[PDB]
Design a protein around this ligand. Structure first.
Ligand SMILES: Cc1nn(C)cc1S(=O)(=O)NC(=O)c1ccc(-n2ccc(OCC(C)(C)C(F)(F)F)n2)nc1N1C[C@@H](C)CC1(C)C
Ligand SMILES: Cc1ccc(NC(=O)C2(c3ccc4c(c3)OC(F)(F)O4)CC2)nc1-c1cccc(C(=O)O)c1
Ligand SMILES: Nc1ncnc2c1ncn2[C@@H]1O[C@H](COP(=O)(O)OP(=O)(O)OP(=O)(O)O)[C@@H](O)[C@H]1O
Ligand SMILES: Nc1ncnc2c1ncn2[C@@H]1O[C@H](COP(=O)(O)OP(=O)(O)OP(=O)(O)O)[C@@H](O)[C@H]1O
Ligand SMILES: CC(C)CCC[C@@H](C)[C@H]1CC[C@H]2[C@@H]3CC=C4C[C@@H](O)CC[C@]4(C)[C@H]3CC[C@]12C
Ligand SMILES: CCCCCCCCCCCC
Ligand SMILES: [Mg+2]
Ligand SMILES: [Mg+2]
Length: 1162
């Protein structure tokens, strides 16, 4: 990774962009490597840009009553922005005066024009210098504006992320992940290219004033008749832009709603497969796409008329201004052609450059104001303190999540070094109590007083990407402390069974880990940090009795006996070793005191075209009409082979020049062709999205584990939007230009078969340079597109762990990691944008030398009479002016076609592919492994389950209990044989095999949607049945506390619910499914013994029949099981009674609670 060559480039090298030569030569022959990409220039580093704009934005907040973000942007970039505007203007003025020189050179071919001939050579010298100046003025200026826009985007994106880490929890409900991704993705490439267009909001009016005075010289008052037509088009295009904005704004809300639902289902893909919810989720997303695709089409129709105004105005603007003059006095062909030359530039300013500039300001200012509102949102108030009385005291705190208070009149005092136990039922407010202490939930009444040093362990374990060792420690590294906590947390046994010991690369959310392993890593992280108060929100949920006992008596009670700590626990054996006990019920303190006190009381193009047959028929329809237009032109043109229009034998060559200047209107695609073309291009994107989503839900789990969350969102957000908005119009413009060039050459070749010969050297030169450039351009665009994924990945993980980020104070670390993602994307994007400027500058320089060669040859060969070489050659160069536009348009199409190839790559992902009456199942030689060629988790497992009995699956955390349950459903690589009721799993199809099971996953899955939709996504059960199940599982009181009884929309994964309420939701689904074989993966993870009775009574009433495989850790749930399966050292051991199982194991029964002990051994 070498230093940027721009740093030491010479002045001439900067001007011509010659410093890009090394990578253009390397990428042509062989593929680019990681070492070929240079570092970013220091000026556009994210760190420097963020500090610059932040320093100026703070001045507005302290100097003006109405702080504006645009004023801070002006103070940073205005003078460079306006500096490039004057050179862009001068290049366009050089363009406006070209017909003054070129028109006289063309007139010198007529022997009658003796005045033009006398100075023809001097006009050639001036014309050549005109071309050179224009080339050197435009391209450096346009690239300078591109660089300013890139720096503006980077600076604004850093401020957005820094604000995100400060947002208050009360506004987090209203800010979804889809909203933030939409804001970033929409401006990722659009914003940077916009600054090249912004200056035309004032350049174009000045061009119109200049050109109208030159047209006035020819046609005195008749000129204004053509201007009035352009004013009508200007008002028409202004109305089109306002309609397009209206449709786009209405569509924005549905796009954000789609992205959040798409992210949720792919994160929980394993639960989706186990439930067999692929069909329901596809139909759910399909209805969201349908509503937003209607607004896409209406916007696309309006944008057709906006982009067709240029081509259709070519004839009428000239005709309206030539006709009144010709009727009063005769007009010569020379004067007609000169009017056309000026009007070509005039039409470009009015109908192409100005409205695009106006729309750019609407887009940029719309995004700036949207970001400005985000930067002023409510901020998290950190009430940190330097010191205290070394104790924490709470005084009659009442809190609301907003009419029922979550907490009321809570008070307690905890002296230094004491342990407080928090008890209660499900939904009693035990988690909310800890949120208020942290300052994450502001109370409406009461006060809290303690020191600022707090350590926090969440009930929902969050794992940041990186190393296991990197998760436990912060940026500091104390080896003696690291070994201490790892031993006390019982992590040594699990670490020794890993390929990298403790240097394993964990994914986002720790997919590769077990449920209880994530709990231990979350607990070890909290105890490693030095603090005054320790908040532990039930870390013993997913742990067995033996591991729980060891950790409690060796880490909580031993390593931190002299530090204040609060423990949420439902075990009576933990209460006996706590200094004080608090019992919550409905948010009220049911009891406060001591224990004793309580005791007493290339191929992408072809595949894109042929995916929909309707597109092929529309293209043929366009082709047939085009042939008739060319044929009609031939007839009328060949037919031409005091009068209103004066023609002479020596002036007849102007006829072909006039045709070329108006060919863009005769060959324009009318609404009979433009509208159906754009309409059918949108149906292609509709089909591709359905195929892409379908294949993702069908891929094997091994493939999906390698995909990162931000790489999934990158394709479904950015690429899909490109196929909807940009590609249909970019293809239309390319097709229009190609037909114009093809038709113009075809018409003049048959009548004059030397123009076709003269244009071959120019055509081949353009094609050869295009082929050379595209070898490197396609690789850089691929690297830049893949550089957007790390930005989205970092955004997702920061929102999921926001509370843990603030608690441990690691905000500066995450801000630095976000700058790495920005700098990584900038390196590829800047390099891609630089080589593109080289190509577009060279394509114009190639045009210049051919025009210079033509100019001098034409003038010198023109003898005393006539001169035919100049007539032919100057016509050929007029045609090649349009091909230059077509070639540049072809590069834009190929840039967008990279998004098509990335979509097809996901579609090509491989697919993973009265019977249930008894429930008997036999297993033979089952071997389970997560990856092919990986280590096995289970080996040669064999057992049999008789029909109708219940089985207890036991074992230590991380032994492979969840692996065994996943092996039944073929969620991993299996090598055994399983026969349910006599049929082998190989014979019957996978889709039928999984439908025989009713599953309760260990990881609960709740998506953004109605209560009714979560319980029943296929809508196959009535409301009465749903309420009937809600009675059995105890969910009526939970539902009725919400405004909508089965109509309330759950958001953010159901954050409104408590942890134990999500368990009852998963129990409700299993009872409603009514499957013969049931696989329950610890259905009572955090329930207190009171709520566990709901599981116990459902186990014998709803599941009175059927074969039930329990996977519980609590000993009380083993009284109902006939058989027992014990996993240890990758092997299953079968028992027939619980007493014989515990007879052989001493340490296991030493950890059993005395209450359960007497129930097992009377
Ligand atoms: C080497 C190298 N390899 N690569 C990848 C980049 C580089 S380069 O940037 O160093 N040079 C070139 O790349 C380069 C520089 C100038 C030119 N010019 C074409 C006309 C022209 O006249 C200029 C003109 C008289 C109009 C005036 F001057 F008056 F304006 N000049 N062509 C260049 N090319 C080299 C090949 C890659 C293809 C080709 C022919 C287009
Ligand atoms: C009076 C004025 C002068 C210069 C600017 N712009 C700039 O200096 C820069 C810029 C910013 C956004 C852009 C843009 C260029 O080009 C775009 F891509 F189109 O978007 C170089 C930063 N802006 C204004 C202005 C407009 C509108 C409102 C206000 C206001 O104070 O309310 C101020
Ligand atoms: N996707 C995966 N890829 C690789 N290894 C995995 C994966 N999922 C789990 N493992 C590993 O396989 C082993 C067993 O997994 P685990 O779910 O299966 O056991 P468990 O008995 O269910 O644990 P717990 O009681 O904590 O839920 C562990 O070492 C775990 O780290
Ligand atoms: N973000 C929230 N917005 C609104 N209500 C909430 C929110 N979080 C929790 N609640 C509600 O507040 C009550 C208590 O929440 P909960 O976390 O706090 O208690 P808990 O004792 O920790 O329960 P559990 O044992 O299930 O973890 C419940 O009625 C729950 O539905
Ligand atoms: C960029 C702008 C502000 C430059 C100046 C614009 C105006 C003042 C210029 C642009 C073109 C100019 C005209 C060009 C040609 C002629 C014909 C000549 O026989 C009389 C002057 C006259 C009619 C000029 C008058 C001034 C004019 C209309
Ligand atoms: C150089 C381009 C400046 C563009 C200024 C846009 C108009 C701003 C008007 C003031 C806000 C209402
Ligand atoms: Mg809780
Ligand atoms: Mg498990």
């Amino acid at each position: 990774m070498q230093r940027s060559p721009l740093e030491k480039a010479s002045v001439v090298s900067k001007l011509f962009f010659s410093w890009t030569r090394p990578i253009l030569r390397k990428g042509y022959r062989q593929r680019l490597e990681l070492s070929d990409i240079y570092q970013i220039p220091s000026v556009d580093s994210a760190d420097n840009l963020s500090e610059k704009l932040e320093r100026e934005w703070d001045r507005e907040l302290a100097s003006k009553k109405n702080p504006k973000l645009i004023n801070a942007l002006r103070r940073c970039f205005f003078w460079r922005f306006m500096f490039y505007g004057i050179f862009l203007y001068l290049g366009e003025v050089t363009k406006a005066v070209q017909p003054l020189l070129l028109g006289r050179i063309i007139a010198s071919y007529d022997p009658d024009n003796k005045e033009e001939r006398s100075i023809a050579i001097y006009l050639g010298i001036g014309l050549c210098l005109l071309f050179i100046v224009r080339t050197l003025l435009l391209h450096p200026a346009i690239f300078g504006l591109h660089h300013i826009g890139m720096q503006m985007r980077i600076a604004m994106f850093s401020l957005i992320y820094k604000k995100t880490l400060k947002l208050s929890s009360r506004v987090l409900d209203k800010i979804s992940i889809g909203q933030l991704v939409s804001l970033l993705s929409n401006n990722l490439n659009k914003f940077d290219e916009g600054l090249a267009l912004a200056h035309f909001v004032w350049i174009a009016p000045l061009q119109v004033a200049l050109l109208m005075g030159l047209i006035w010289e020819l046609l005195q008052a008749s000129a204004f008749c053509g201007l009035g037509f352009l004013i009508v088009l200007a008002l028409f295009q202004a109305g089109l832009g306002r309609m397009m904005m209206k449709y786009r704004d209405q569509r924005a809300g549905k796009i954000s709603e789609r992205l959040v639902i798409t992210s949720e289902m792919i994160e929980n893909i394993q639960s989706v497969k186990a439930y067999c919810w692929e069909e329901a989720m596809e139909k759910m997303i399909e209805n969201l796409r349908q509503t937003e695709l209607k607004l896409t089409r209406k916007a696309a129709y309006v944008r057709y008329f906006n982009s067709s105004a240029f081509f259709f105005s070519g004839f009428f603007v000239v005709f309206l201004s030539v006709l009144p003059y010709a009727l009063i006095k005769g007009i010569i062909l020379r004067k007609i052609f000169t009017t056309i030359s000026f009007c070509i530039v005039l039409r470009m300013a009015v109908t192409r450059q100005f409205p695009w500039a106006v729309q750019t300001w609407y887009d940029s200012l719309g995004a700036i104001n949207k970001i400005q509102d985000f930067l002023q949102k409510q901020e998290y108030k950190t009430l940190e303190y330097n010191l205290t009385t070394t104790e924490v005291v709470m005084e009659n705190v009442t809190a609301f999540w907003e009419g029922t208070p979550v907490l009321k009149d809570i008070n307690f005092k905890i002296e230094r070094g004491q342990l407080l136990a928090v008890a209660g039922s499900t939904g009693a407010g035990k988690t909310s109590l800890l949120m208020v202490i942290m300052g994450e939930l502001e109370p409406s009444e009461g006060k809290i007083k303690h020191s600022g040093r707090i350590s926090f362990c969440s009930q929902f374990s969050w794992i940041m990407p990186g190393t296991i060792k990197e998760n436990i420690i912060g940026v500091s590294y104390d080896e003696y402390r690291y070994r201490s906590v790892i031993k006390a947390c019982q992590l040594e046994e699990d670490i020794s069974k890993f390929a990298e010991k403790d240097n394993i690369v964990l994914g986002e959310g720790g997919i590769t880990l077990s449920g209880g392993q994530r709990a231990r890593i979350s607990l070890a992280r909290a105890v490693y940090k030095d603090a005054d108060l320790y908040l532990l929100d039930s870390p013993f949920g997913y742990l067995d009795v033996l591991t729980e006992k060891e950790i409690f008596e060796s880490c909580v009670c031993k390593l931190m006996a002299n530090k204040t700590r609060i423990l949420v626990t439902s075990k009576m054996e933990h209460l006996k070793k706590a200094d004080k006990i608090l019992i919550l019920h409905e948010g009220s303190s049911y009891f406060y005191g001591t224990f004793s006190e309580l005791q007493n009381l290339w191929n992408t193009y072809l595949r894109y075209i042929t995916v929909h047959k309707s597109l092929i028929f529309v293209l043929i329809w366009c082709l047939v009409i085009f042939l008739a237009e060319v044929a009609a032109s031939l007839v009328v043109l060949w037919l031409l082979g005091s009068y209103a229009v004066i023609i002479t034998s020596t002036s007849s060559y102007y006829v072909f020049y006039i045709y070329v200047g108006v060919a863009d209107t005769l060959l324009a695609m009318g609404f009979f062709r433009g509208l159906p073309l754009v309409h059918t291009l949108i149906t292609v994107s509709k089909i591709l999205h359905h195929k892409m989503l379908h294949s993702v839900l069908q891929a094997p789990m091994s493939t999906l584990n390698t995909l990162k969350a931000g790489g999934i969102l990158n394709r479904f957000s950015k690429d899909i939007a490109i196929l909807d908005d940009l590609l249909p119009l970019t293809i239309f413009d390319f097709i229009q230009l190609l037909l114009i060039v093809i038709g113009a050459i075809a018409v003049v070749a048959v009548l004059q078969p030397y123009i076709f010969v003269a244009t071959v050297p120019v055509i081949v030169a353009f094609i050869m340079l295009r082929a050379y450039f595209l070898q490197t351009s396609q690789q850089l665009k691929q690297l830049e597109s893949e550089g957007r994924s790390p930005i989205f990945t970092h955004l997702v993980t920061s929102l999921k762990g926001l509370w843990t980020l603030r608690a441990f104070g690691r905000q500066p670390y995450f801000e630095t990691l976000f700058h790495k993602a920005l700098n990584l994307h900038t390196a590829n994007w800047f390099l891609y944008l630089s080589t593109l400027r080289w190509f577009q500058m060279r394509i114009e320089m190639i045009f210049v030398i051919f025009f210079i060669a033509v100019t001098f040859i034409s003038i010198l060969t023109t003898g005393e009479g006539e001169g035919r070489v100049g007539i032919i050659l100057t016509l050929a160069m007029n045609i090649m002016s349009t091909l230059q536009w077509a070639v540049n348009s072809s590069i834009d199409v190929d840039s967008l076609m990279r998004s098509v190839s990335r979509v097809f790559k996901f579609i090509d992902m491989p697919t993973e592919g009265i019977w249930p009456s008894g429930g008997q199942m036999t297993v033979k030689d089952l071997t389970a492994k997560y990856t092919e060629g990986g280590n096995a988790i289970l080996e040669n497992i064999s057992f049999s389950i008789s029909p109708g009995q219940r089985v207890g699956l036991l074992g230590r955390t991380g032994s492979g209990k969840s692996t065994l349950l996943s092996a039944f459903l073929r969620l991993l690589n299996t090598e055994g044989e399983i026969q349910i009721d006599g049929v082998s799993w190989d014979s019957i199809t996978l889709q039928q095999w999984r439908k025989a099971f009713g599953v309760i996953p260990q990881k609960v899955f709740i998506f953004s949607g109605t209560f009714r939709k979560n319980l029943d996504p296929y809508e196959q059960w009535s409301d009465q049945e749903i309420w009937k199940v809600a009675d059995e599982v105890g969910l009526r009181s939970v539902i009725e506390q919400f405004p909508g009884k089965l109509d309330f929309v759950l958001v953010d994964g159901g954050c409104v619910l408590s942890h134990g309420h999500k368990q009852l939701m998963c129990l409700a689904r299993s009872v409603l499914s009514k499957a013969k074989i049931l696989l329950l993966d610890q259905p009572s993870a955090h329930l207190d013994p009171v709520t566990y009775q709901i599981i116990r009574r459902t186990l014998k009433q709803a599941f009175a029949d059927c074969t039930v495989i329990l996977c519980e850790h609590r000993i009380e749930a083993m009284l109902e099981c006939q058989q027992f399966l014990v996993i240890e050292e990758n092997k299953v051991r079968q028992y027939d009674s619980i007493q014989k199982l515990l007879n052989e194991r001493s340490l296991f029964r030493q950890a059993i609670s005395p209450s359960d002990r007497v129930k097992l051994f009377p």
